[PDB]
Amino acid sequence: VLSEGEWQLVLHVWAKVEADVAGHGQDILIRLFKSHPETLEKFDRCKHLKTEAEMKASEDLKKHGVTVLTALGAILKKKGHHEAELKPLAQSHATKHKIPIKYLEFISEAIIHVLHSRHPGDFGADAQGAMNKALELFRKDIAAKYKELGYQG
Numbered sequence: 001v002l003s004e005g006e007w008q009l010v011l012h013v014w015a016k017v018e019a020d021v022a023g024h025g026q027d028i029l030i031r032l033f034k035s036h037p038e039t040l041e042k043f044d045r046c047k048h049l050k051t052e053a054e055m056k057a058s059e060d061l062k063k064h065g066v067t068v069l070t071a072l073g074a075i076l077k078k079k080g081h082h083e084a085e086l087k088p089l090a091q092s093h094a095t096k097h098k099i100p101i102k103y104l105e106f107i108s109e110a111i112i113h114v115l116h117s118r119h120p121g122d123f124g125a126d127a128q129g130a131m132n133k134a135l136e137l138f139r140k141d142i143a144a145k146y147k148e149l150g151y152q153g
């Protein structure tokens with residue numbers, strides 16, 4: 001359980017993300033794909049991309065960054081009361097996309113990296129620790145639902 005103050009730090013920096021969801025989503029996915037290229041294999045429409053400029057020009061990558069950040073922002077705004085939001089996401093990521101928890105760790109790392117890079121004044125130690133706790137809670141809860149669905153990833 002995060003404190004109310006921790007949730008407010010999470011949501012304060014998330015408002016900054018919402019000023020340009022697509023640009024943030026591009027930076028986060030490009031960071032993920034650069035730092036962990038095996039993750040790029042999961043995206044059929046993006047897996048041929050080679051350079052940073054190609055990734056920034058990609059309409060498919062830009063759309064998918066928005067898909068991810070829209071779902072995650074709704075989850076964060078539930079302040080841990082996210083079972084109904086995780087249920088469809090666990091469903092598809094366990095049984096169709098087959099996204100192991102370690103890949104969710106990689107993308108959480110990329111999110112933290114981009115938020116620190118773009119919003120350092122709203123992402124000091126207090127806010128980083130809160131965001132870390134929020135993403136850890138997301139990964140804990142979705143791992144439990146993965147297993148309920150028969151997926152040990």
Ligand code: HEM
Pocket residue numbers: 039040042043044067068069071072088089092093097099103104107
């Ligand atoms: C914060 C973590 C994530 C969130 C909130 C998220 C959210 C979503 C949403 C809402 C969709 C579309 C609906 C669906 O299929 O469930 C989606 C699709 C997908 N996700 Fe995730 N995702 C996350 C992490 C990841 C990661 C780390 C990977 C792979 C490394 C991944 C792989 C995919 C793939 C392959 C699709 C299908 C894309 C397509 O064919 O259009 N997801 N994700």
